[PDB]
Amino acid sequence: SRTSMKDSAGRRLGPKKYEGQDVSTGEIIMRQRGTKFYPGENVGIGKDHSIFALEPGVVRYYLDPFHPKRKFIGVALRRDLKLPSPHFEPTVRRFGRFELTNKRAAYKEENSISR
Amino acid sequence: KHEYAPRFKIVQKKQKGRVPVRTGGSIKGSTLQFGKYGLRLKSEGIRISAQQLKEADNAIMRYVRPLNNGHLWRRLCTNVAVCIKGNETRMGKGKGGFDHWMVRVPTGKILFEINGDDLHEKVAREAFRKAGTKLPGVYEFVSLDSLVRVGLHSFKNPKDDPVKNFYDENAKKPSKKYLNILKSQEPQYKLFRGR
Amino acid sequence: RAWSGDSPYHLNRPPKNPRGSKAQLPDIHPIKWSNIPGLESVVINCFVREARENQLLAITAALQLQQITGCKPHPIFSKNDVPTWKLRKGHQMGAKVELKGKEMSQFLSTLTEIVLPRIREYKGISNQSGNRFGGISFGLTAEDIKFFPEIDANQDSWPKTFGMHININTSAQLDYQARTLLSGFQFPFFGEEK
Amino acid sequence: GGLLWKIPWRMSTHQKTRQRERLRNVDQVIKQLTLGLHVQRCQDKGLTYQEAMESKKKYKPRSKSLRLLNKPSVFPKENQMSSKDKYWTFDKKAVGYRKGIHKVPKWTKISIRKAPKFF
RNA sequence: UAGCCUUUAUAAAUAAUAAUUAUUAUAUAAUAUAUUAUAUAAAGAAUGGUACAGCAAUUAAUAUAUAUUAGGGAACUAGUUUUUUAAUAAUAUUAAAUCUCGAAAUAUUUAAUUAUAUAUAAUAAAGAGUCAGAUUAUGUGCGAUAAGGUAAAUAAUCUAAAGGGAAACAGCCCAGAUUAAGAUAUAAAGUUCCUAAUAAAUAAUAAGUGAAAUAAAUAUUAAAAU
RNA sequence: AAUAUUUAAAAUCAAAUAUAUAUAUAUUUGUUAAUAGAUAAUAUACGGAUCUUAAUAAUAAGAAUUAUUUA
RNA sequence: GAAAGAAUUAAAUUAAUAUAAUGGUAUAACUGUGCGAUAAUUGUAACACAAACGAGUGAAACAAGUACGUAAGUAUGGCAUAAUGAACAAAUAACACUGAUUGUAAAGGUUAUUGAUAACGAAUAAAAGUUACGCUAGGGAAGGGUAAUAUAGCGAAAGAGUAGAUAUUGUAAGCUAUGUUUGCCACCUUCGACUCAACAUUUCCUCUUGGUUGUAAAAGCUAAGAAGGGUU
Ligand SMILES: [Mg+2]
Ligand SMILES: [Mg+2]
Ligand SMILES: [Mg+2]
Ligand SMILES: [Mg+2]
Ligand SMILES: [Mg+2]
Ligand SMILES: [Mg+2]
Ligand SMILES: [Mg+2]
Ligand SMILES: [Mg+2]
Ligand SMILES: [Mg+2]
Ligand SMILES: [Mg+2]
Ligand SMILES: [Mg+2]
Ligand SMILES: [Mg+2]
């Protein structure tokens, strides 16, 4: 006969970074088929709908009244911040860059311009 | 009349499974609904086959046909497929071929239930007894005044189950998604959704 | 219908279908000064089944519609594949046109005043016709289409002519109101009404 | 079939007595944990050991595990339990839906107190 | 090769292991309904769809002196009295490996705190063995709800574990032998003799039933509730 | 004392817990036996002995079975 | 009171998705449309997921240039998960790296590209059978378990039995017993005859007994006790 012994190995899907966990840029938070979890803020979504943090912070799972029937995963820039942040409140942003105190480095950056 | 031969479009082999043990106190199928006397399992949950059920059916029909407007209701359907293999075979080589249909009967379910204008309790008892002698478990007689068997040695009454609405319970102990929907219907979100 | 909340499984369960129908039906309001029935549109359907073998008959049918009505016809294209009828998909089988205002008024006036009186054995429109929420449909054959002024004027240019269905859409809440309205516009009715 | 694991289907009086004592011992452990938490709460509030023990108002535990273990409907005490559930445990592959609690592996250490209402 | 083991060490080291606080609500107070505080209740921060439960949608089953459709059953020149077959509605019942509208416990897992430091984790140099596994429990696939069967999934033990109990006993119950001693408290198991150690209470058995491997449908004789 | 389903702690009833001090809510537990069916091949196999009690009647026995328990 | 807007609510992902199945999708990922055909481009790629290796997957950011957009911005192929193959040896192009006395060459290297090892981590460019004449080194990679089958009993009784399910009989199904049969597992690698038999009883004969419109007698059928003797 024709034996039925063909199958594909389990795709290692599921949450790869849990709530309250600290994350850095690019780290993968969730691997999924389709958008079971949508991206919130400070987080992006890839070709295969992989959720990945865009800034350092703390991972939070939440729900947003603007998008009922939609789960969200996002990154809070501090632990003490509830992630479904108030709508009419200035966005929390991270400058990220550092000032070039070194004279030579400042000179090079000043003299570097685009094509 | 296909209770002993379901009409599945794609006939498919099925895994063995286990006969459910209803530890949540389920009484689905353990009440009289269509008739006035009935037959219910009394021993542990077991498996019945189409041939056995048909034999019990004709055993009861031998008593139900000689009646005035007498009817028999079959509460069970053989909705599981089973496979067999020849004895002169080594283990393995896949599954076998379809052999028969079967049904999983838990402890309290009712198999048959009958009614009739000229029906008499003693006649019903003898009919159901003779029918039970042709099935692979232990069976008992049920009337409209009889309690519902929820276990091997435990009965209960459907009137004890409280009637309660669940919308109100959900409202009083909301879910996070429900609260999110409610808070989405508020104007400060609806008026700014942007879609 | 809505599920009674006697079981928890009813919390997020989608609502049930209407009792007798798989589609919801509209409510019927009393007739008042603001909602009197009236004609809202007319649509003519011309499906030349013999165009399955000849695509030019569709153009001829469109010209028939344009001359009768005066509006721009719109093509009809096959959608289903039925072998017994030798109907493929994606081919031009006829034309349609929708009429409103003065143009539909003229079309109905000319119908009633010229064409319907010139039919051989015409008793009117069936009293058991029309969608149950306002709207009356009736057909015309090729010989009937030959009675229109434009065709009669230049018979030479009409070796073949095609029939068509006519759908009158009104504001009537129910069909009998639309029947009364059309009778006012002089449309005879012969059958026994529902 | 082949091996002889001569485990009798019913316990003896001595085995039953030992099982009763073990159940009671676990009950005592739970009681002592709750009492210690109460005395700690009193001492944190300011009282001393003597009137912490003599306090009319006993503080109940605020942890899920301790609260549930203290509820009789979740972890019934030995004297509350039934004779059936003291010695027999629920099995769905056995005639009568029961098996001797002494056929459970490591039965003198693990604890079973509750079986389904109608089983 | 990875996995499991071993030797020697490294610090801007506790990063490891375990549990608690996270929540919702009530009451009583305050402070400024909203908080904060105390007490209490709830299987109690985030993730998930198994049991259970259910028949929603899908896939299947039953019924009707209730309706639509078709051939249409004594009068008959189109229209019935009807325990007439099938399909579609209505109502009421049912189940499923590839059905979950409800939904556990265990579980995954986060920060801080507490406990474990005669202790974990990580890292550096270097050295192996192993890649035939076996039972006992609990969920399963196959087999026939067979096998001291076979295939994998959680413990545990044997493997590589002496000692007590299971009569005898690789895998079961308890407990891990550095060497002695033998006073004390014991685990599992037991206390008529063989054989270390017991005295009682309340009912039932009369069949040596049974007493350390419970054999079924059924039949007879006996027990109380109205 | 007679016609007499069912083998039950769900429901009711009775005792107890946690809140309550003039009483109520919630929770936990308590609902049958004996015999027959019975079943092979070196030898009866609870491990063996043996184990059910009885006035007169003496220091002095009366389950060593089953079900709940005590010291 | 009425028109025309803006839309809101319920329902819907069952249609459609380039292609299986699953997850996702109306805020559309589905559909229509204008530009466009551009990002189906170039040099570094952190960090994660997955993971023995070798490979695979998501991707922030820096730099060069494109297309669309008023702008914000989007685009490093397709809603996602399959659509594939190492190194050696050859071949084509570019690079300006080395040029075995020097110069150029030849040849090698770097960058890009091609052909498939489907036993699909691919022995070689290139390979089938037979031994009952066989040889060496090893492992075993009738008893034991099971009772589907076979045999036997029991419960119930549809039907035969001139009449009456139970004298006899008992046809599908139900509950068990044996381990004599045919199989199943893999712990453990001679059929018949002659001679002598020992043991069991599920008794063929011999003794005792119950039933039998179906025991008048005789001969029988069925069943209970019975293993002393006998059984070509
Ligand atoms: Mg898979
Ligand atoms: Mg179920
Ligand atoms: Mg290694
Ligand atoms: Mg769900
Ligand atoms: Mg499943
Ligand atoms: Mg810590
Ligand atoms: Mg191996
Ligand atoms: Mg094995
Ligand atoms: Mg060990
Ligand atoms: Mg070894
Ligand atoms: Mg040992
Ligand atoms: Mg002993």
Ligand SMILES: [Mg+2]
């Ligand atoms: Mg020993």
Ligand SMILES: [Mg+2]
């Ligand atoms: Mg005995």
Ligand SMILES: [Mg+2]
């Ligand atoms: Mg109760």
Ligand SMILES: [Mg+2]
């Ligand atoms: Mg013997």
Ligand SMILES: [Mg+2]
């Ligand atoms: Mg696509």
Ligand SMILES: [Mg+2]
């Ligand atoms: Mg889909």
Ligand SMILES: [Mg+2]
């Ligand atoms: Mg990892």
Ligand SMILES: [Mg+2]
């Ligand atoms: Mg790697």
Ligand SMILES: [Mg+2]
């Ligand atoms: Mg696209």
Ligand SMILES: [Mg+2]
């Ligand atoms: Mg050069």
Ligand SMILES: [Mg+2]
């Ligand atoms: Mg040279």
Ligand SMILES: [Mg+2]
């Ligand atoms: Mg070259």
Ligand SMILES: [Mg+2]
């Ligand atoms: Mg190969």
Ligand SMILES: [Mg+2]
């Ligand atoms: Mg390979």
Ligand SMILES: [Mg+2]
């Ligand atoms: Mg591979």
Ligand SMILES: [Mg+2]
């Ligand atoms: Mg080859």
